[PDB]
Amino acid sequence: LCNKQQQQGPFTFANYQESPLNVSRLQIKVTKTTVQDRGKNFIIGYRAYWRSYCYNGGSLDGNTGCYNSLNPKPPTKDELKTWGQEEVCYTGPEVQDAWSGDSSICFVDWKMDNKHRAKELEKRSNNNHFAHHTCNLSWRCGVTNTHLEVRLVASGTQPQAVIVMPNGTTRAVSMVAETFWTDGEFSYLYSPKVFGTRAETKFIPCFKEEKFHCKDGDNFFEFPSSGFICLPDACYKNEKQKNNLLHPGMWNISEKLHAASVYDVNNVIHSLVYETESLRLSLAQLDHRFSVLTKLMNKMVSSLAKIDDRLIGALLEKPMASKFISPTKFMVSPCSQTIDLFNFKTLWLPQLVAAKVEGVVSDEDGWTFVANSKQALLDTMTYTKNGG
Amino acid sequence: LCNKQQQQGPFTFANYQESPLNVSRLQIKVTKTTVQDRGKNFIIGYRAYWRSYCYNGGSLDGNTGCYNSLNPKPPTKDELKTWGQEEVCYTGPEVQDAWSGDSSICFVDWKMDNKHRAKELEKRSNNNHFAHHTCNLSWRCGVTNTHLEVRLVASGTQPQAVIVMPNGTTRAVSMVAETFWTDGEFSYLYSPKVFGTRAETKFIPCFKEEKFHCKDGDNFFEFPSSGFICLPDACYKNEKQKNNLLHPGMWNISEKLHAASVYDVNNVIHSLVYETESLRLSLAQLDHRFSVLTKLMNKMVSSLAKIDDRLIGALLEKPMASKFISPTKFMVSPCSQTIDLFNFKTLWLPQLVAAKVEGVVSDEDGWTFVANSKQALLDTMTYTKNGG
Amino acid sequence: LCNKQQQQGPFTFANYQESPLNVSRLQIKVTKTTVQDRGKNFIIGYRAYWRSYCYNGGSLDGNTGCYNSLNPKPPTKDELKTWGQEEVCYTGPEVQDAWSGDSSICFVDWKMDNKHRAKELEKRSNNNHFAHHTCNLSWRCGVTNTHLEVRLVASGTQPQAVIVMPNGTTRAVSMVAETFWTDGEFSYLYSPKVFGTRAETKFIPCFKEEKFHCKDGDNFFEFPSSGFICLPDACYKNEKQKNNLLHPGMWNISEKLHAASVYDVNNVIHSLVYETESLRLSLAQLDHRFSVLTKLMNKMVSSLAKIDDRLIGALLEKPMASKFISPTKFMVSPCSQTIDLFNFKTLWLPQLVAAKVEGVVSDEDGWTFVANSKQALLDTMTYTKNGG
């Protein structure tokens, strides 16, 4: 029995209210600028010669001695074109122990006609012909056909296509014809199919938090305040600010040159574990909520099924009638428009995601070719060989 | 009052239906091939000598001059074994300013007996003994005991154990005895406890999406179409295709040579933020659903508890009776088999995960030993010292 | 009709119970030790000279020949201070083809007074003055002002501030005045605003799993057993073990020197996809649970609304009365304290997270300055030029 004598209240049922959240999903309409060019579009060729012009007139003659030089002869544009097309470099002649008469070979304007697939010079010299000159001449050359990835910078407005050097220096790509240049021993030719930049209009998905965290294919980036940002391979400008002149957000060039340490990646790993534990806490909390709901609903049905003896059968989708032998125990006997009480929509599921990994600039095939060639020159120039 | 006069319908209750998803959890039975070998199993030894054999017969003699050479003398197999075991390299004698009679020391077949822990050569020469020969001889040597990580490639079927060079070239590991080889100055000996490959049968967990995203310890990889893939350290072959000859999926060798840039890792960071925001959206949506449910259930209990005055006490697990003073306000007075309406199972929780981070090949102890030794040779060969 | 004749049971309602989880959220009170110093606090200066002192007395004289040397003259502390302050290095004189009388210039104690912004030496020599000495002298120097990041090690208890060399060697920072040192050609001066270490008391968030996975700003780390760990930039000591002497957990120095490979980062990517699929499975499972709940609640309301014809209107928050024309179809006609049945709290949401990415030691500005200077010395010392 109860004591209906004495009340307490009045009471109300406390509702649960979700915590408001400012994260929304946006499709941001942008103009996307790229400078992509596919295939072997970059040719690198080097050429130099070691020259040793000596005279032996004895220790009394002031002209007794050697005049040695390492001279770079970078190929011309058309030379480099036929080198890459033939995968072959052309040099002058290999001169060894050419004395008094033939020593004039040291200054000929040799008109390069010796063809090699690859050729390293020999650092050889000798001055053992008395009262006479001696000539030694050795050539080096190399060529490679690679693919060059051109990047985008700003320097102001109007993103520009550039080539990034391993030292950090940037070189503008010519928008008229076949950017070519020369640096010491090396000559570089970049020949893309089409010139300039490409621009497309597209929507990129973002999450608005003051802060926009966006995605475009395998690119992931924080979209800035003014709706204009440049990544290495692409620039994203928000229309509505299409007709505005703005300096875009600039990527740091050093991030593409310098490698990431094992410790940095292990830190990202630890941050992922921390977020996975935080995620597991949220999931466990929702699991406990579902357990509370099933306990409440079990008691609610136990109360209502006493009045409606067909309810438990409708819940189980089998025709039956219920009869309780106890407030908790029961026995079982055998037997247009819609309204939405929930307004539940389809559940947003985080999609799969794979970030782009490209490496560092020095690891690129062209700059690796350059670095190896220079290292080979160091390796061959360690000591002088006797051309005797 | 209501107007029971005028109806509208008939209506129905709209149910909520979850969106179907093709992601399943699979335990995939595979044969796993490894080539693991633990401990110091790799010995690297280098040796060379600088020789300067000069003759001074005056400027008239054609034989006046120096014959200099850097000659590599890589140790033999048994030599390298006793070097690593003793942590000591053996070379010939240090010859300095040995002239006419002792200059014959420049060609002796020296029978290496000078022991060093570490030894760099000196590039010294002198030709200041008239009518006489002069000899200079300087030796270099080094040794190291390291651990070598052997990888697996395919070249077809039947994954093979190999050593990967920093330049990308691969060298097969002998499956008979103690793979040994020589390259210029250096000699390499790899001595594992057991030869060949090891194969184990195991189940790896995966998520089936056409696409399989798997995990094995700290290895994470996309399992391919034909159920055969090779990673650097292990190959995974699906039985059912155990008896089939297939080329496995091959890892790209360059991914283990070339480092990842700071920009790449920052991109993964941005992709993680994007996924965390997407995750927060899903969690907030489920939070709003729970708020809607508690509001509905509060009204449902307020309706049913009017009929069953003991229900609210059963929900609160305290004996009490209810009496409503209003459609929303009430006062309170003091007082085998089971059926599953929910069929709820235990909630799948994402487990913790830590990917393996190993670095690049050039950073390995053996190849760092090689690279430093070569750099030391460059450093010592910059100029000739006078052995006078 | 039913057959109230024949029962079955008694039955009970099976509740759902959540799976217990040991992950908790902790605010761990720690003493945090840092050695941070902001700005250009590191000066590096190098200086050397190439000297070629030759004598030409003919092939008969034993003193005929060249005495050449590369000599390092690292600047003093005050010299390096005025170099960095002026961005200018001071050297001796450039001597070329100074013979018999002026050849005494090769040993003068030159009292460096030649100012350069940057200066590379030339490796030039000549011995073409008979019965006379010849002198050649060429200088090199450089300076840079950079920011040095000092790290923390243990060697026992009491974390210590150190500078990490690219080779892995560590050099203690003086806690008294302006740590200065000299290595060959180079001199290094590090001048921080304040000396020693800084310690702050703070709470860091963690997830307790035996295992603690913590976060501090952009630092993410596993907090160890004894509550004492040192990262590169900071050490975390748990009070309660404030008064205890413990060796802290030590970070591996090689993780900050060696870069992470593209394959390592792609593995983290694959581990993220695996966790995202696992997360999607959990979300889909909760989505199916909500679908089951709405189906149960729809039938429960259809049963109770037959008794309370105003209930459906209260659920829809519109005044109406219901009247069922079928067990599933109905028509519609127009019309203090609280109790918590749920005890639901605000949902824990995983917050955003961005790990710190700093790169490798060799990529630091100071060590890049050093590495480039040494490479320039190699480049300039490839062959001797005639000072004639």
Side-chain angles (χ1 to χ4, degrees):
Chain A
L1 198 76
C2 304
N3 192 10
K4 329 191 211 80
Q5 211 79 266
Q6 317 296 353
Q7 326 289 72
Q8 179 49 257
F11 281 105
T12 323
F13 282 138
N15 286 319
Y16 172 62
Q17 193 65 41
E18 68 268 59
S19 291
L21 202 185
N22 296 91
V23 174
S24 58
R25 220 179 334 127
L26 280 161
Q27 295 275 348
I28 296 189
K29 193 185 189 182
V30 300
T31 282
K32 182 192 170 177
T33 313
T34 56
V35 281
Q36 182 210 139
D37 186 78
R38 291 213 165 107
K40 278 181 180 345
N41 47 25
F42 200 45
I43 312 187
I44 307 184
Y46 69 91
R47 174 174 59 197
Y49 66 85
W50 162 262
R51 170 206 283 156
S52 194
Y53 191 69
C54 307
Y55 181 69
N56 181 11
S59 315
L60 290 167
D61 195 357
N63 304 339
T64 304
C66 287
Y67 282 41
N68 305 341
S69 60
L70 259 177
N71 302 98
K73 277 291 158 184
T76 72
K77 200 180 183 173
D78 313 325
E79 259 186 299
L80 187 49
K81 288 168 183 241
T82 197
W83 286 15
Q85 182 194 349
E86 299 183 7
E87 297 211 8
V88 153
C89 47
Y90 290 94
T91 49
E94 188 93 23
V95 173
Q96 175 177 15
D97 203 351
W99 53 287
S100 59
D102 313 313
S103 76
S104 79
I105 197 58
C106 267
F107 313 90
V108 152
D109 191 63
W110 306 270
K111 253 53 176 298
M112 334 286 180
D113 49 7
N114 295 40
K115 140 206 291 183
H116 324 269
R117 284 184 53 179
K119 174 67 179 59
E120 192 52 62
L121 67 87
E122 185 172 48
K123 184 200 183 182
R124 59 163 183 272
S125 168
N126 68 290
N127 195 30
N128 63 323
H129 295 288
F130 187 78
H132 284 339
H133 288 274
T134 310
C135 180
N136 283 280
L137 192 66
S138 200
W139 290 81
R140 78 190 309 254
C141 67
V143 74
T144 197
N145 290 289
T146 68
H147 158 90
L148 181 62
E149 211 74 75
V150 157
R151 275 62 145 96
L152 283 157
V153 291
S155 149
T157 319
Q158 271 51 76
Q160 309 137 342
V162 292
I163 309 157
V164 290
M165 304 290 123
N167 62 4
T169 279
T170 245
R171 169 163 283 269
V173 167
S174 81
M175 285 169 289
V176 278
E178 266 199 339
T179 175
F180 165 86
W181 81 92
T182 280
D183 197 339
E185 267 177 61
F186 297 82
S187 285
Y188 310 84
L189 179 72
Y190 172 71
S191 307
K193 323 248 178 47
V194 80
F195 295 97
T197 69
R198 163 169 211 262
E200 61 170 10
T201 310
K202 69 180 299 183
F203 301 87
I204 65 165
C206 303
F207 290 100
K208 179 181 203 157
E209 169 86 292
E210 192 184 26
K211 298 276 186 174
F212 300 86
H213 305 280
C214 298
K215 162 175 145 34
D216 178 27
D218 51 0
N219 286 348
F220 303 82
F221 53 97
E222 203 174 303
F223 205 52
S225 43
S226 42
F228 196 9
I229 187 183
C230 278
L231 304 183
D233 55 341
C235 297
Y236 301 95
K237 195 180 203 200
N238 192 21
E239 281 134 30
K240 292 288 118 190
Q241 269 105 46
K242 167 167 182 166
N243 281 131
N244 295 123
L245 294 164
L246 314 106
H247 298 346
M250 204 72 250
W251 56 286
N252 282 126
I253 170 65
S254 54
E255 280 179 32
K256 298 284 282 166
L257 306 177
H258 298 166
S261 76
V262 163
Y263 183 85
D264 294 350
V265 175
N266 273 344
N267 200 48
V268 168
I269 285 179
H270 280 294
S271 72
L272 185 46
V273 174
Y274 186 85
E275 283 294 287
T276 290
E277 289 281 49
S278 186
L279 183 270
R280 286 155 72 79
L281 264 195
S282 299
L283 286 181
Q285 187 160 352
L286 300 179
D287 199 20
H288 163 75
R289 292 188 174 185
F290 269 112
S291 182
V292 163
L293 285 194
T294 59
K295 296 182 179 176
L296 295 178
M297 290 183 66
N298 269 340
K299 304 168 181 294
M300 290 172 57
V301 155
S302 184
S303 181
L304 177 56
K306 295 184 179 72
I307 305 146
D308 191 329
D309 61 349
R310 299 298 308 279
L311 168 68
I312 292 179
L315 303 173
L316 292 181
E317 294 181 280
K318 330 158 181 192
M320 79 176 36
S322 78
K323 187 156 179 54
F324 281 75
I325 70 163
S326 162
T328 73
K329 325 175 69 167
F330 60 81
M331 311 287 286
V332 153
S333 292
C335 283
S336 69
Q337 336 189 18
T338 73
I339 281 195
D340 199 337
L341 303 166
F342 314 97
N343 306 121
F344 283 175
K345 304 308 180 227
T346 47
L347 178 60
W348 168 249
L349 295 176
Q351 318 205 234
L352 298 185
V353 152
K356 180 199 306 179
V357 177
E358 280 194 342
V360 302
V361 159
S362 47
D363 280 338
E364 293 175 17
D365 275 1
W367 307 129
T368 303
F369 176 83
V370 162
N372 293 334
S373 147
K374 298 187 177 170
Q375 184 58 232
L377 179 66
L378 285 178
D379 280 4
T380 188
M381 294 290 302
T382 50
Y383 72 99
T384 305
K385 291 85 185 176
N386 208 295
Chain B
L1 198 76
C2 304
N3 192 10
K4 329 191 211 80
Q5 211 79 266
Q6 317 296 353
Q7 326 289 72
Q8 179 49 257
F11 281 105
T12 323
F13 282 138
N15 286 319
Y16 172 62
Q17 193 65 41
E18 68 268 59
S19 291
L21 202 185
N22 296 91
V23 174
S24 58
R25 220 179 334 127
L26 280 161
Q27 295 275 348
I28 296 189
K29 193 186 189 182
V30 300
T31 282
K32 182 192 170 177
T33 313
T34 56
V35 281
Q36 182 210 139
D37 186 78
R38 291 213 165 107
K40 278 181 180 345
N41 47 25
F42 200 45
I43 312 187
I44 307 184
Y46 69 91
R47 174 174 59 197
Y49 66 85
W50 162 262
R51 170 206 283 156
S52 194
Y53 191 69
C54 307
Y55 181 69
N56 181 11
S59 315
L60 290 167
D61 195 357
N63 304 339
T64 304
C66 287
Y67 282 41
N68 305 341
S69 60
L70 259 177
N71 302 98
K73 277 291 158 184
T76 72
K77 200 180 183 173
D78 313 325
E79 259 186 299
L80 187 49
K81 288 168 183 241
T82 197
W83 286 15
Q85 182 194 349
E86 299 183 7
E87 297 211 8
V88 153
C89 47
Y90 290 94
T91 49
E94 188 93 23
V95 173
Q96 175 177 15
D97 203 351
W99 53 287
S100 59
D102 313 313
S103 76
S104 79
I105 197 58
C106 267
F107 313 90
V108 152
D109 191 63
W110 306 270
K111 253 53 176 298
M112 334 286 180
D113 49 7
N114 295 40
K115 140 206 291 183
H116 324 269
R117 284 184 53 179
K119 174 67 179 59
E120 192 52 62
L121 67 87
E122 185 172 48
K123 184 200 183 182
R124 59 163 183 272
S125 168
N126 68 290
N127 195 30
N128 63 323
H129 295 288
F130 187 78
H132 284 339
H133 288 274
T134 310
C135 180
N136 283 280
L137 192 66
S138 200
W139 290 81
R140 78 190 309 254
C141 67
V143 74
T144 197
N145 290 289
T146 68
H147 158 90
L148 181 62
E149 211 74 75
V150 157
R151 275 62 145 96
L152 283 157
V153 291
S155 149
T157 319
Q158 271 51 76
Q160 309 137 342
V162 292
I163 309 157
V164 290
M165 304 290 123
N167 62 4
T169 279
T170 245
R171 169 163 283 269
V173 167
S174 81
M175 285 169 289
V176 278
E178 266 199 339
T179 175
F180 165 86
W181 81 92
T182 280
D183 197 339
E185 267 177 61
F186 297 82
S187 285
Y188 310 84
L189 179 72
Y190 172 71
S191 307
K193 323 248 178 47
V194 80
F195 295 97
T197 69
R198 163 169 211 262
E200 61 170 10
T201 310
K202 69 180 299 183
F203 301 87
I204 65 165
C206 303
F207 290 100
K208 179 181 203 157
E209 169 86 292
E210 192 184 26
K211 298 276 186 174
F212 300 86
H213 305 280
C214 298
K215 162 175 145 34
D216 178 27
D218 51 0
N219 286 348
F220 303 82
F221 53 97
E222 203 174 303
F223 205 52
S225 43
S226 42
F228 196 9
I229 187 183
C230 278
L231 304 183
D233 55 341
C235 297
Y236 301 95
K237 195 180 203 200
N238 192 21
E239 281 134 30
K240 292 288 118 190
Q241 269 105 46
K242 167 167 182 166
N243 281 131
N244 295 123
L245 294 164
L246 314 106
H247 298 346
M250 204 72 250
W251 56 286
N252 282 126
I253 170 65
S254 54
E255 280 179 32
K256 298 284 282 166
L257 306 177
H258 298 166
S261 76
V262 163
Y263 183 85
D264 294 350
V265 175
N266 273 344
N267 200 48
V268 168
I269 285 179
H270 280 294
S271 72
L272 185 46
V273 174
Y274 186 85
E275 283 294 287
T276 290
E277 289 282 49
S278 186
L279 183 270
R280 286 155 72 79
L281 264 195
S282 299
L283 286 181
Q285 187 160 352
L286 300 179
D287 199 20
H288 163 75
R289 292 188 174 185
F290 269 112
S291 182
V292 163
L293 285 194
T294 59
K295 296 182 179 176
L296 295 178
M297 290 183 66
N298 269 340
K299 304 168 181 294
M300 290 172 57
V301 155
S302 184
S303 181
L304 177 56
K306 295 184 179 72
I307 305 146
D308 191 329
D309 61 349
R310 299 298 308 279
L311 168 68
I312 292 179
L315 303 173
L316 292 181
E317 294 181 280
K318 330 158 181 192
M320 79 176 36
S322 78
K323 187 156 179 54
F324 281 75
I325 70 163
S326 162
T328 73
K329 325 175 69 167
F330 60 81
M331 311 287 286
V332 153
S333 292
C335 283
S336 69
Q337 336 189 18
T338 73
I339 281 195
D340 199 337
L341 303 166
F342 314 97
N343 306 121
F344 283 175
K345 304 308 180 227
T346 47
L347 178 60
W348 168 249
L349 295 176
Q351 318 205 234
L352 298 185
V353 152
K356 180 199 306 179
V357 177
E358 280 194 342
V360 302
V361 159
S362 47
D363 280 338
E364 293 175 17
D365 275 1
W367 307 129
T368 303
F369 176 83
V370 162
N372 293 334
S373 147
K374 298 187 177 170
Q375 184 58 232
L377 179 66
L378 285 178
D379 280 4
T380 188
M381 294 290 302
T382 50
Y383 72 99
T384 305
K385 291 85 185 176
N386 208 295
Chain C
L1 198 76
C2 304
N3 192 10
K4 329 191 211 80
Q5 211 79 266
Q6 317 296 353
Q7 326 289 72
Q8 179 49 257
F11 281 105
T12 323
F13 282 138
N15 286 319
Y16 172 62
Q17 193 65 41
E18 68 268 59
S19 291
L21 202 185
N22 296 91
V23 174
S24 58
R25 220 179 334 127
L26 280 161
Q27 295 275 348
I28 296 189
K29 193 185 189 182
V30 300
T31 282
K32 182 192 170 177
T33 313
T34 56
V35 281
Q36 182 210 139
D37 186 78
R38 291 213 165 107
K40 278 181 180 345
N41 47 25
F42 200 45
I43 312 187
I44 307 184
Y46 69 91
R47 174 174 59 197
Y49 66 85
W50 162 262
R51 170 206 283 156
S52 194
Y53 191 69
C54 307
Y55 181 69
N56 181 11
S59 315
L60 290 167
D61 195 357
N63 304 339
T64 304
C66 287
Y67 282 41
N68 305 341
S69 60
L70 259 177
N71 302 98
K73 277 291 158 184
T76 72
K77 200 180 183 173
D78 313 325
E79 259 186 299
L80 187 49
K81 288 168 183 241
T82 197
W83 286 15
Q85 182 194 349
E86 299 183 7
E87 297 211 8
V88 153
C89 47
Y90 290 94
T91 49
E94 188 93 23
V95 173
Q96 175 177 15
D97 203 351
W99 53 287
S100 59
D102 313 313
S103 76
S104 79
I105 197 58
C106 267
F107 313 90
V108 152
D109 191 63
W110 306 270
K111 253 53 176 298
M112 334 286 180
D113 49 7
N114 295 40
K115 140 206 291 183
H116 324 269
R117 284 184 53 179
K119 174 67 179 59
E120 192 52 62
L121 67 87
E122 185 172 48
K123 184 200 183 182
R124 59 163 183 272
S125 168
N126 68 290
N127 195 30
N128 63 323
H129 295 288
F130 187 78
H132 284 339
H133 288 274
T134 310
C135 180
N136 283 280
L137 192 66
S138 200
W139 290 81
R140 78 190 309 254
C141 67
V143 74
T144 197
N145 290 289
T146 68
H147 158 90
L148 181 62
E149 211 74 75
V150 157
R151 275 62 145 96
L152 283 157
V153 291
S155 149
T157 319
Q158 271 51 76
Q160 309 137 342
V162 292
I163 309 157
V164 290
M165 304 290 123
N167 62 4
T169 279
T170 245
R171 169 163 283 269
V173 167
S174 81
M175 285 169 289
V176 278
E178 266 199 339
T179 175
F180 165 86
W181 81 92
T182 280
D183 197 339
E185 267 177 61
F186 297 82
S187 285
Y188 310 84
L189 179 72
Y190 172 71
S191 307
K193 323 248 178 47
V194 80
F195 295 97
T197 69
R198 163 169 211 262
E200 61 170 10
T201 310
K202 69 180 299 183
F203 301 87
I204 65 165
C206 303
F207 290 100
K208 179 181 203 157
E209 169 86 292
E210 192 184 26
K211 298 276 186 174
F212 300 86
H213 305 280
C214 298
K215 162 175 145 34
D216 178 27
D218 51 0
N219 286 348
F220 303 82
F221 53 97
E222 203 174 303
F223 205 52
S225 43
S226 42
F228 196 9
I229 187 183
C230 278
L231 304 183
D233 55 341
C235 297
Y236 301 95
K237 195 180 203 200
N238 192 21
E239 281 134 30
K240 292 288 118 190
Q241 269 105 46
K242 167 167 182 166
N243 281 131
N244 295 123
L245 294 164
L246 314 106
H247 298 346
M250 204 72 250
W251 56 286
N252 282 126
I253 170 65
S254 54
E255 280 179 32
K256 298 284 282 166
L257 306 177
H258 298 166
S261 76
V262 163
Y263 183 85
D264 294 350
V265 175
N266 273 344
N267 200 48
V268 168
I269 285 179
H270 280 294
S271 72
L272 185 46
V273 174
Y274 186 85
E275 283 294 287
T276 290
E277 289 281 49
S278 186
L279 183 270
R280 286 155 72 79
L281 264 195
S282 299
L283 286 181
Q285 187 160 352
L286 300 179
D287 199 20
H288 163 75
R289 292 188 174 185
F290 269 112
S291 182
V292 163
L293 285 194
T294 59
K295 296 182 179 176
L296 295 178
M297 290 183 66
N298 269 340
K299 304 168 181 294
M300 290 172 57
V301 155
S302 184
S303 181
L304 177 56
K306 295 184 179 72
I307 305 146
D308 191 329
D309 61 349
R310 299 298 308 279
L311 168 68
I312 292 179
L315 303 173
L316 292 181
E317 294 181 280
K318 330 158 181 192
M320 79 176 36
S322 78
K323 187 156 179 54
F324 281 75
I325 70 163
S326 162
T328 73
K329 325 175 69 167
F330 60 81
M331 311 287 286
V332 153
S333 292
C335 283
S336 69
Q337 336 189 18
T338 73
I339 281 195
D340 199 337
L341 303 166
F342 314 97
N343 306 121
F344 283 175
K345 304 308 180 227
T346 47
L347 178 60
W348 168 249
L349 295 176
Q351 318 205 234
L352 298 185
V353 152
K356 180 199 306 179
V357 177
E358 280 194 342
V360 302
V361 159
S362 47
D363 280 338
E364 293 175 17
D365 275 1
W367 307 129
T368 303
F369 176 83
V370 162
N372 293 334
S373 147
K374 298 187 177 170
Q375 184 58 232
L377 179 66
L378 285 178
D379 280 4
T380 188
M381 294 290 302
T382 50
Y383 72 99
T384 305
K385 291 85 185 176
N386 208 295

